[PDB]
Amino acid sequence: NGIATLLQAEKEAHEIVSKARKYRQDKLKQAKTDAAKEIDSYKIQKDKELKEF
Amino acid sequence: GNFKSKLKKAMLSQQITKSTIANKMRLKVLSAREQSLDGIFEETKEKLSGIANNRDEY
Predict the structure, then answer these.
(1) 3-state SS of chain A: helix, strand, coil percent to 5?
(2) Taking CB atoms and an 8 Å limit, are A43 and B2 in contact across chains?
(3) Quick check: B27 contacting A, CB < 8 Å?
(4) Chain B residues with CB-CB distance to A40 below 8 A
(5) How far, in Å, CA of B55 to CA of B1, rounded?
(6) Which end of chain A has fewer CB atoms within 10 angstroms, the N or the C?
(7) What is the rounded distance in angstroms from the CA atom of residue A9 to the CA atom of residue A52?
(8) How many whole angstroms from its chain centre is CA A10?
(9) Distance between CA B4 and CA A43 in Å, rounded?
(10) Hey, is the C-beta of A53 within 8 angstroms of any chain B C-beta?
(11) In 3-state terms, what secondary structure has residue B55?
(12) How many Cα atoms sit within 13 Å of B51 on the Cβ side?
């Protein structure tokens, strides 16, 4: 039916939103790379202290 | 942990520098001892040839 098709479109939009949730996780993956860089930055600071010694 | 391992490498490198110098210094004394000893035997070469040249006590 037309109403059911509109509901399917809303489900498709939710499916797109579900795909966007992975994109949101992909958007959050950019912060993960920054978090990984921060982890390396902490090691770099520790390495710099070791290098200074 | 990798940074700590890198720091441990510097300690090993510092030990390596100390170990190389310490071992080389010890053999330098021994090399001088053999060189001094080789001089004593070198001096004995002339005396052994000198005894031959006498032709009287030889």
Answers:
(1) 95, 0, 5
(2) yes
(3) no
(4) none
(5) 81
(6) N
(7) 62
(8) 24
(9) 9
(10) yes
(11) coil
(12) 7
Flag whether residue B7 sits within 8 Å of chain A, measured between CB atoms: yes
CA distance linking residue A16 with residue A24, whole number of Å: 12
Method: cryo-EM
In angstroms, the CA A38 to CA B2 distance is: 15
Resolution (A): 3.3
CB A53 within 8 A of CB B6: no
Taking CA–CA distances from A44, the nearest residue in chain B reads B3
Cβ atoms of residues B7 and A53 within 8 Å: yes
Under a CB-based contact definition with an 8 Å cutoff, are residues A43 and B2 in contact? yes
CB contact under 8 Å between B7 and A50, yes or no, is: yes
Residue B16, chain A, CB below 8 Å: the answer is: no
In angstroms, the CA A35 to CA A38 distance is 5
